[PDB]
Every structure is written in structure tokens, then in C-alpha cells.
């Protein structure tokens, strides 16, 4: 029910798996012999951007076709390019 | 034979058209001019059945060469609009397939013509939009009707 | 079959960002037609696996297989029951 994400920095983030399955790439990575039983490690992603990605997961989870205005997702200026890069490899 | 034909007007019309076709042949486009007129008269009062085949023969003869036929296409689309509005359409899609082939051919031909030169294709460009808008009209007409699987394959294929 | 499924899973990025762009649209494969080139258009990895498996193995070795399947059908008509799972899987493979 809970899945572990390990960044290249070394920090480990535990997340509800129903949240994590939003991104197709993670779903495909779990599929296959690596059934892991879970924990997942990325050799190149730094911790902070992956934390922002996790916050994106939970923020999308909170509001789905929800009524009224949806609060915008704050973006830091420098990390914008890194987020654009990291969008592909997770395909969220 | 001629004495018997003397009384019937329609037989005389058909005989005159046949004689003109036999003598003149397909050399000049003038052979097409009477036929449309004849069909027009029929189109004013008849069930339109012979009008369709007359105009199709005219289209074949004209398309055998290189002539603009956009006015003919828009007129004949008007004929379909009217006969649809009369709600007695019982439309046959095969004629639609043939005219789709004709309009698709003329589109490419005049696009090539426009590619040949640009000094005197402004009227050709206007005819380009005219043909496009007609094609929209005929697609709508095809939409308003329904028929068999092979036919929907052909209209869609074109 | 399992290898092909896992392989298709593993090439997900290549499928998503490369193949689909040059892939033939299913629409023209149906009503449009429009194709006669002497080339194999880029296809999905699993599609490659299955199409190749049909092309290179089952075609040369089909007559004897179907003959022995028909023969075993007579044996079952005699009453004896061979392994139903194997035959069912073979038929389902088609």
C-alpha cells in the first residue's frame, strides 16, 4: 500500500501507492520481474526535485474535477528548468 | 422508323442528341452545351433521374480533357440540395463516388496549374476556394444521406 | 509471450516519444488505404515481436501441427482425453 522512493541524493520518501501510480513510468517500472517484495531508487534524480514531484502527486490527488477555483502550484524560478527536464523521465 | 418517331417529342430530342454526338464526337466541348440545357428542362418538371445521368455523361466528356467545371459542380450540388429538400431523394451513392473522383482530380490538376505560374492564377485561386466550399457542401449532402457498407467505404476513401 | 510483454513494458519511453510519431495511423490502414511502399513502417516493440514470431516460425511449421491436432481430435472422439491445457493454449495462440 506504501512505496519507497530513493533519490540520487540518498533521501528516502514513503508515499501511498495509489498516489504514486499517477505517473505511467512508475507503473511500468513496478511491472516486470522487479516486483520488489516496495522501494524504488533513481540513480540521477536529486532529492528536492523529487520532493516537488511528490507534492505534485498529492496536490493532484486532493483536487480531481473538484468544484470552484483550484489553488495554483507554486514554482521556484531556478528549478523550473529542472522540473521540465524531470517531467519526461517520469512521464506524469 | 423516322415516320414513327415523328410524333414523339422525347424520341426526337434523343435522336438529335445521338446524331450530334455521332457527328461532332468528343473533339470540342460544345457537344456538352445542349445536354445540360435539356437536363435543365427535365430538372424543372421531372423526377431528375435522367438529369443525373445526362450531367454525368457531360462530366465524363469534359473531364476527358482539361476544362474548368466548378460552375457545373456548384449547379449540380444545388440540384442535390433541392432534391434532398423535396425529401424524395432515394439517392444512389455510386454517382457520388464518381463525382468525388472528378472533384478530387480537378483539385489536384488546378493546384498543379497554380504551381505552374502565379501571374494569372488569382482567378484560379478564387476557383480554389470555390472548389473547397463546394466540397464542403457535397460532404454535408453525403452526411445527410445513408446507404451501404461498400459505399460508405468509397465516400470515406475519397 | 511473457518476455514480449515485459520487453514492451521496458521500452516505454522509446515507444512513447519515438515510434508513435512515425507510426502509421490506424485510420489510413482502414478506410484510407493509400500505401504500397516496399518498407516495413515503424511499429510497437510488442507488435514487432508478435508479427515477427508469426512471420518466421508458425508459417513454415503449420501443416504438420494442424494435421496432428486433427488426428488427436479423432483420439478424443474415441474417448481418451489428452492434456486439454496444452491444446487449448496452442489453439488460443492463433
From Swiss-Prot, chain A:
Its main location: nucleus. It is found in: Nucleus. Signal peptide: none annotated. Pathway: Protein modification; protein ubiquitination. Ubiquitinated by the DCX(AMBRA1) complex, leading to its degradation by the proteasome. GO terms for biological process: protein ubiquitination; regulation of transcription by RNA polymerase II; target-directed miRNA degradation; transcription initiation at RNA polymerase II promoter; ubiquitin-dependent protein catabolic process. Keywords: Host-virus interaction, Nucleus, Transcription, Transcription regulation, Ubl conjugation, Ubl conjugation pathway. Overexpressed in prostate cancer cell line PC-3 and breast cancer cell line SK-BR-3. GO terms for molecular function: protein-macromolecule adaptor activity; transcription corepressor binding. CDD domains: BTB_POZ_EloC. InterPro entries: ELC1, SKP1-like, SKP1/BTB/POZ_sf, Skp1_comp_POZ. GO terms for cellular component: Cul2-RING ubiquitin ligase complex; Cul5-RING ubiquitin ligase complex; cytosol; elongin complex; nucleoplasm. It comes from the Eukaryota. Transmembrane segments: none annotated. Belongs to the SKP1 family. SIII, also known as elongin, is a general transcription elongation factor that increases the RNA polymerase II transcription elongation past template-encoded arresting sites. Subunit A is transcriptionally active and its transcription activity is strongly enhanced by binding to the dimeric complex of the SIII regulatory subunits B and C (elongin BC complex). Heterotrimer of an A (ELOA, ELOA2 or ELOA3P), ELOB and ELOC subunit. The elongin BC complex interacts with EPOP; leading to recruit the elongin BC complex to Polycomb group (PcG) target genes, thereby restricting excessive activity of the PRC2/EED-EZH2 complex. (Microbial infection) Interacts with HIV-1 Vif; forming an active cullin-5-RING E3 ubiquitin-protein ligase complex (ECS complex). PANTHER family: ELONGIN-C. This is Elongin-C.
Swiss-Prot record, chain B:
TPR repeats lie at residues 32-65. It comes from the Eukaryota. It comes from Homo sapiens (Human). This is Protein fem-1 homolog B. The record marks 30-31 as: Cleavage. Its main location: cytoplasm. The chain holds residues 313 to 470 of 627 of the full protein. Belongs to the fem-1 family. Transmembrane segments: none annotated.
Swiss-Prot record, chain C:
It is found in: Nucleus. It comes from the Eukaryota. Coiled coil: none annotated. The Cullin neddylation domain restrains the RING domain of RBX1 in the E3 ubiquitin-protein ligase complex; this restraint is removed upon neddylation of the cullin. Core component of multiple cullin-RING-based ECS (ElonginB/C-CUL2/5-SOCS-box protein) E3 ubiquitin-protein ligase complexes, which mediate the ubiquitination of target proteins. CUL2 serves as a rigid scaffold in the complex and may contribute to catalysis through positioning of the substrate and the E2 ubiquitin-conjugating enzyme. The E3 ubiquitin-protein ligase activity of the complex is dependent on the neddylation of the cullin subunit and is inhibited by the association of the deneddylated cullin subunit with TIP120A/CAND1. Component of multiple Cul2-RING (CRL2) E3 ubiquitin-protein ligase complexes consisting of CUL2, Elongin BC (ELOB and ELOC), RBX1 and a variable substrate-specific adapter; this complex is also known as ECS (Elongin BC-CUL2/5-SOCS-box protein) complex and may consist of CUL2 or CUL5. Component of a ECS(VHL) or CBC(VHL) complex containing CUL2, RBX1, ELOB, ELOC and VHL. Component of the ECS(MED8) complex with the probable substrate recognition component MED8. (Microbial infection) Interacts with human respiratory syncytial virus (HRSV) protein NS1. Belongs to the cullin family. This is Cullin-2. The chain holds residues 95 to 188 of 745 of the full protein.
Amino acid at each position: 500500500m506504501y512505496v519507497k522512493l530513493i533519490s540520487s541524493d540518498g533521501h528516502e520518501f514513503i508515499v501511498k501507492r495509489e498516489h504514486a501510480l499517477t505517473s505511467g513510468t512508475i507503473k511500468a517500472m513496478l511491472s516486470g520481474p522487479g516486483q520488489f517484495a516496495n522501494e524504488v531508487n533513481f540513480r540521477e534524480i536529486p532529492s528536492h526535485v523529487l520532493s516537488k514531484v511528490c507534492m505534485y502527486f498529492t496536490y493532484k490527488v486532493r483536487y480531481t474535477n473538484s468544484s470552484t477555483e483550484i489553488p495554483e502550484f507554486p514554482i521556484a524560478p531556478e528549478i523550473a528548468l529542472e522540473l521540465l527536464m524531470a517531467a519526461n523521465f517520469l512521464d506524469c | 422508323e423516322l415516320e414513327s418517331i415523328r410524333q414523339d417529342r422525347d424520341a426526337l430530342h434523343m435522336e438529335g442528341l445521338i446524331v450530334r454526338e455521332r457527328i461532332l464526337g468528343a473533339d470540342n466541348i460544345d457537344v456538352s452545351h445542349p445536354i445540360i440545357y435539356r437536363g435543365a428542362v427535365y430538372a424543372d418538371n421531372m423526377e431528375f433521374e435522367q438529369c443525373i445521368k445526362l450531367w454525368l455523361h457531360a462530366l465524363h466528356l469534359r473531364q476527358k480533357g482539361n476544362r474548368n467545371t466548378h460552375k457545373d459542380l456548384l449547379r449540380f450540388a444545388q440540384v442535390f440540395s433541392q432534391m434532398i429538400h423535396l425529401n424524395e431523394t432515394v439517392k444512389a451513392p455510386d454517382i457520388e463516388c464518381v463525382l468525388r473522383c472528378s472533384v478530387l482530380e480537378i483539385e489536384q490538376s488546378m493546384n498543379r496549374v497554380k504551381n505552374i505560374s502565379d501571374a494569372d492564377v488569382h482567378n484560379a485561386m478564387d476557383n480554389y476556394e470555390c472548389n473547397l466550399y463546394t466540397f464542403l457542401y457535397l460532404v454535408c449532402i453525403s452526411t445527410k444521406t445513408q446507404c451501404s457498407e461498400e459505399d460508405q467505404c468509397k465516400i470515406n476513401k475519397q | 509471450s511473457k518476455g514480449a510483454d515485459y520487453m514492451d513494458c521496458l521500452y516505454r519511453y522509446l515507444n512513447t516519444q519515438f515510434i508513435k510519431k512515425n507510426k502509421l495511423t490506424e485510420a489510413d490502414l482502414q478506410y484510407g488505404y493509400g500505401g504500397v511502399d516496399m518498407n516495413e513502417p515503424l511499429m510497437e516493440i510488442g507488435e514487432l515481436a508478435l508479427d515477427m514470431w508469426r512471420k518466421l516460425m508458425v508459417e513454415p511449421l503449420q501443416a504438420i501441427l494442424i494435421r496432428m491436432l486433427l488426428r488427436e481430435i479423432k483420439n478424443d472422439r474415441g474417448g481418451e482425453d489428452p492434456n486439454q491445457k496444452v491444446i487449448h493454449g496452442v489453439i488460443n495462440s492463433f
